[PDB]
Design a protein around this ligand. Structure first.
Ligand SMILES: *[C@@H]1O[C@H](CO)[C@@H](O[C@@H]2O[C@H](CO)[C@@H](O[C@@H]3O[C@H](CO)[C@@H](O)[C@H](O)[C@@H]3O)[C@H](O)[C@H]2NC(C)=O)[C@H](O)[C@H]1NC(C)=O
Ligand SMILES: *[C@@H]1O[C@H](CO)[C@@H](O[C@@H]2O[C@H](CO)[C@@H](O[C@@H]3O[C@H](CO)[C@@H](O)[C@H](O)[C@@H]3O)[C@H](O)[C@H]2NC(C)=O)[C@H](O)[C@H]1NC(C)=O
Ligand SMILES: CC(C)CCC[C@@H](C)[C@H]1CC[C@H]2[C@@H]3CC=C4C[C@@H](OC(=O)CCC(=O)O)CC[C@]4(C)[C@H]3CC[C@]12C
Ligand SMILES: *[C@@H]1O[C@H](CO)[C@@H](O[C@@H]2O[C@H](CO)[C@@H](O)[C@H](O)[C@H]2NC(C)=O)[C@H](O)[C@H]1NC(C)=O
Ligand SMILES: *[C@@H]1O[C@H](CO)[C@@H](O)[C@H](O)[C@H]1NC(C)=O
Ligand SMILES: *[C@@H]1O[C@H](CO)[C@@H](O)[C@H](O)[C@H]1NC(C)=O
Ligand SMILES: *[C@@H]1O[C@H](CO)[C@@H](O)[C@H](O)[C@H]1NC(C)=O
Ligand SMILES: *[C@@H]1O[C@H](CO)[C@@H](O)[C@H](O)[C@H]1NC(C)=O
Ligand SMILES: *[C@@H]1O[C@H](CO)[C@@H](O)[C@H](O)[C@H]1NC(C)=O
Lengths: 34, 158, 316, 212, 320, 37
């Protein structure tokens, strides 16, 4: 069953690329204003 | 343009370590699981040359030396990491050539297979073809990283 | 005069290699100072006979002698016909021999079953059965029936059956007359097939010996038995031959044969052969106490007419 | 050119000791001189001819065979089995495809010649023969899969053979399906590494946010 | 007195498809014997033929020497079974032999192994139960090993074996293993293995007691029948309703054992509709003089399912 | 059959891009910690 593994890994990629964007905008608003 | 690369240096050291460890992990399963006496030596040319061992060792050593030279900045590890980077570039170019010949051998074998699931030969050749492709991508990326760090270290002394 | 010419031969000793088969033809009671013996194989002359005419005995004008032959094993196992030619008083006398043919070619087993005494001496419709077993298929198998005196034979009823072990069996049933079987008429069943080198020939006759009428004693249920069932026994003994039929009755009503058992006959005490059997019928308690009577009747060849003898058991 | 094919000239895959078996490469009747590479039990043999002729089989001949002609690839491996029983049920294949063919035979050992043979499939008899011959099964379907054995008489002694399982499949099992389960098994390590890095990064940023 | 050896032949007639008698005549000729000092006995596969009534015919007499032959009648089915027929000639105390058989090929006759359980009389009365492994149809007794293994325990006793050479040029080997009773009631299994260097595998036969539901036999005895007043008297012993079929019946004439050749017992017959019950009949026929000597007969039965000490006697007396 | 075998390659590419992008934020956050100290 390859498709359920692809589904859970796609969900993992979605939540990790959401958390990366959250940390990226936090680093942006921290370092932009010194 | 020199200030654009001093910030992005230890990531360039990290990606070589990652490429080398993935190379070692890819070589280990081929070393352990596969009974290599049942398959041709033309298909397994990347294993008979031993590339995922010395390429892994040189990439890990070059990345570790670049990381420690970044975090130490003493005047002994600098101008000694350049040799470990140029030998990694030589190993990466040799690996690119070896993987290209192995890809051509895989295409020559896979011409004579009506399906990917005919027997063990076509299936093992197809799996080794995916291994060759995603070793070639990482070898190109690590070669570019090593060459660009070599350029950065050369341009300081020039 | 008619001299008696019979041909006897030696055969395989299992304790020796025995590569030579030895043929003898005996001239019994021939006239004095006569006889010359020549040997033939496959209706052709043999001049390597080396016969030795040995005198046996002399009784007046009559005399006895024999001749002896020396043939190899391969000349005997070829199933050729060997005959000894006797020239006594100008007349010609013959005596042929061969090897006995294989009775199971291609592993085919054949049985010839005699008629039952119930069909023979009571029902009046006896039947002979030729059961042919262990066949690969039915096809190209012919079964033939041969009588002894008359060429007018009955119609056979041939049927086939495929078994659970993937083998085909053929059963042929020939209705015979009771009178001819009483006087001792022989019958033959010949099974033929193109792949058979020789046909299978089986013969049957009424069994020989000295006839003895059976003595039948019936026993009450045992006095220690006051349980839910009662057991009634019939003892039949001192009868030859082995063919017998036993029946049980319930106030002149026939009990089915699945409600009682009979034992295999056993030979007793010699030298003439006698047999005994036991017939057992077990009824329930309520069926026994219904003020009825039971009979045990047997049918045998050696009994007086009409070959039926009854023993009645009742509590009254 | 293509992959080599190794075939047996007595094509029974189960034989007894003392039997003759000839191993053939890609296929012709020409025992060539030093042109074919032979591998037995994952080891290179000294037989370099195109025809590997075994005059008397032994228990040490029961392995795996791969032939490779000059200019060709290695072959699909074939398996030989040498046994020692009173009665052996031979076969030409243990796994056969749909619309395929295979033979079975009941064979005795060392001049104990068998008669009155009955062939069973899953303890159901389907064939009787007086002699021991081929039982050809053509146009193989799903119903021919089961356990096969035979009985017979040596001279007058009934003997039984061990059961042999023959399976009919729509496609061959190709014995290496777990090799493609590596890349998702690497992704579940890489994403775990990513989460372990994210937790430390967020902890360090939350500790430096309290400093300011 | 010197010993004169005669010459013994064994000749016979052949089959005839165009005949209906289906008999084969066997002739055993004896030449050169002494008058009134000859005797010819017939055998078939080491078993004496009592019920034939063979005819003995004198040929001639030459002074102190004579010639006789004996004739035997056998069926065609007995001849075609490839059995060996022997005539044994006895003269002045010595024995002379002649054998014959139907001619056939040199096909390797297979060997047969039989394993039989101990008798209930030795099991429950005598106390010494033995298992015997019988090996038949061997061309020679050399290089044959017969071993015994157990299932639960390991301590096997000494197994004495013996070899016999038969008239049909075959050798038989029988080995006897003495076992304990209580292991046989408790239900352990034994196994006899026969090996040879020319065998592909050893021939293995295993044995245990019969599995099922045990039922004690109810035995009954019958008086001689009321219609019998002849010179002989028949006594009956009906034994029924038992499982398994292993049983032992012996008669006792005034507390003295009667030999087993003086009475007969029928083969067990199954009944009761898949409830696995058996019945047998025991018959012993005595004369009127033995019956009228005020004896007291007894039918004694030993079975496994009986209560201890596993015996059952019924008494037949003419007074009661 | 072939679609899942293709999809493992893009899964590998996404994982590689993810760790290569997370390590840069890790070193930048650690450098912020070592600079604000
Ligand atoms: C295949 O199975 C059939 C039956 O399912 C076997 O046929 C049976 O063979 C026995 C042995 O020959 C027959 O017993 C004989 O019967 C005659 C006539 O009553 C009797 O005179 C003999 O003394 C013997 O008891 C039996 O009748 C026969 N069954 C039928 C229905 O005909 C056959 O032998 C099996 N073949 C193989 C190779 O296993
Ligand atoms: C050569 O002659 C000997 C002596 O008669 C033959 O041995 C006998 O063979 C029969 C058939 O196997 C044996 O009968 C069997 O007996 C066992 C034990 O009671 C029983 O369980 C079987 O059901 C069967 O009835 C018989 O005991 C045996 N006799 C002796 C003394 O061992 C032998 O078969 C002959 N060989 C040839 C090739 O004719
Ligand atoms: C063995 C196969 C199956 C997979 C191997 C991949 C990863 C387990 C490895 C390969 C390289 C490793 C990286 C090598 C170097 C670094 C830099 C390192 O940066 C620091 O020193 C930051 C300060 C701190 O450690 O907190 C953080 C961990 C990281 C990303 C490592 C995380 C784990 C990685 C990705
Ligand atoms: C090749 O490998 C096979 C394993 O399949 C070997 O066969 C075994 O041999 C041993 C004795 O050497 C026997 O005890 C086994 O029963 C055999 N196994 C089977 C399945 O038959 C064979 O001997 C090997 N041959 C060589 C030359 O090494
Ligand atoms: C034929 O063989 C027998 C037995 O071997 C022998 O006694 C006899 O003399 C032989 N016949 C001749 C004519 O030699
Ligand atoms: C029997 O089978 C063998 C091996 O499978 C084969 O060589 C032979 O030609 C076959 N014979 C027939 C008549 O099918
Ligand atoms: C195969 O077996 C099934 C069930 O056992 C049956 O329905 C089907 O008809 C069989 N196939 C053939 C071709 O007889
Ligand atoms: C043997 O058979 C012959 C031929 O029928 C007969 O004359 C003879 O009386 C028979 N012998 C015995 C003892 O029955
Ligand atoms: C029997 O055993 C001996 C040794 O005890 C051995 O030499 C011989 O080969 C064996 N076989 C035969 C047939 O004698």
């Amino acid at each position: 069953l390859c498709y359920i593994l692809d589904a859970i890994l796609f969900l993992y990629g979605i939540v990790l690329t959401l958390l990366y964007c959250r940390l990226k905008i936090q680093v942006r608003k921290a370092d932009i204003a010194s | 343009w020199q200030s654009f690369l001093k910030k992005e240096l230890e990531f360039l050291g990290v990606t070589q370590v990652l490429v080398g460890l993935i190379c070692l992990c890819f070589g280990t399963v081929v070393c352990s699981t596969l009974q290599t006496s049942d398959f041709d030596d033309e298909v397994l040319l990347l294993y008979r040359a031993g590339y995922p061992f010395w390429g892994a060792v040189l990439f890990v050593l070059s990345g570790f030396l670049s990381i420690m030279s970044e975090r130490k900045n003493t005047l002994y590890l600098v101008r000694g990491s350049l040799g470990a980077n140029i030998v990694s570039s030589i190993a990466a170019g040799l690996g690119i050539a070896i993987l290209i010949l192995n890809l051509s051998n895989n295409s020559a074998y896979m011409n004579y297979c009506k399906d990917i699931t005919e027997d063990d030969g076509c299936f093992v050749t197809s799996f080794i073809t995916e291994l060759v492709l995603m070793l070639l991508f990482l070898t190109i990326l690590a070669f570019c990283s090593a060459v660009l760090l070599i350029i950065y270290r050369i341009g300081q002394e020039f | 005069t008619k001299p008696t010419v019979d041909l006897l031969h030696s055969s395989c000793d299992p304790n020796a290699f025995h590569s030579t088969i030895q043929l003898y033809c005996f001239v019994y009671g021939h006239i004095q100072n006569d006889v010359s013996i020549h040997w033939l194989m496959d209706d052709r002359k043999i001049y390597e006979t080396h016969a030795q005419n040995v005198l046996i005995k002399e009784e007046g004008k009559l005399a006895s002698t024999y001749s002896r032959l020396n043939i190899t094993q391969q000349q005997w196992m070829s199933e050729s016909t060997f005959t000894c030619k006797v020239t006594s008083q100008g007349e010609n006398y013959w005596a042929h021999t061969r090897r006995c043919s294989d009775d199971e070619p291609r592993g085919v087993i054949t049985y010839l079953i005699p008629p039952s005494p119930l069909d023979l001496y009571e029902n009046g419709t006896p039947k002979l059965t030729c059961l042919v077993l262990d066949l690969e298929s039915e096809e190209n198998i012919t079964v033939t029936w041969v009588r002894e005196r008359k060429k007018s034979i009955g119609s056979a009823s041939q049927r086939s059956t495929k078994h659970h072990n993937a083998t085909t069996s053929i059963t042929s049933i020939l209705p015979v007359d009771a009178k001819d079987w009483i006087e001792g008429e022989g019958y033959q069943c010949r099974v033929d097939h193109p792949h058979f080198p020789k046909p299978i020939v089986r013969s049957i006759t009424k069994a020989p010996g000295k006839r003895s009428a059976p003595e039948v004693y019936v026993f009450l249920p045992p006095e220690e038995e006051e349980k839910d069932k009662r057991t009634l026994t019939c003892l039949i003994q001192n009868f030859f031959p082995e063919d017998i039929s036993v029946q049980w009755l319930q106030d002149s009503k026939l009990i089915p044969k699945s409600q009682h058992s009979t034992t295999t006959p056993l030979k007793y005490n010699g030298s003439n052969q006698r047999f005994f059997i036991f017939s057992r019928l077990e009824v329930t308690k309520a069926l026994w106490t219904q003020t009825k009577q039971f009979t045990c009747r047997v049918i045998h060849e050696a009994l007086r007419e009409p070959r039926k003898l009854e023993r009645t058991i009742s509590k009254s | 050119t293509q992959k080599s094919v190794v075939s047996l000239d007595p094509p029974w895959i189960r034989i007894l000791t003392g039997d003759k078996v000839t191993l053939i490469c890609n296929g012709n009747n020409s025992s060539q001189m030093n042109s074919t590479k032979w591998i037995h039990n994952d080891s290179i043999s000294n037989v370099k001819s195109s025809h590997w002729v075994i005059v008397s089989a032994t228990i040490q001949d029961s392995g795996k065979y791969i032939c490779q002609k000059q200019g060709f690839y290695k072959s699909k491996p074939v398996y030989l089995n040498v046994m020692q029983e009173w009665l052996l049920l031979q076969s030409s294949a243990d796994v056969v495809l749909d619309n395929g063919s295979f033979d079975i035979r009941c064979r005795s050992w060392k001049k104990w010649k068998v008669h009155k043979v009955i062939y069973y499939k899953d303890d159901i008899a389907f064939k009787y023969s007086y002699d021991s011959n081929n039982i050809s099964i053509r146009k193989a379907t799903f119903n021919d899969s089961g356990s096969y054995h035979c009985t017979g008489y040596l001279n007058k002694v009934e003997c039984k053979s061990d059961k042999f399982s023959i399976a009919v499949v729509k496609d061959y099992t190709i014995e290496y399906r777990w090799l493609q389960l590596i890349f998702p098994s690497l992704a579940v390590i890489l994403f775990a590494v990513d989460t372990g890095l994210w937790f430390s990064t967020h902890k360090q940023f939350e500790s430096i946010l309290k400093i300011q």
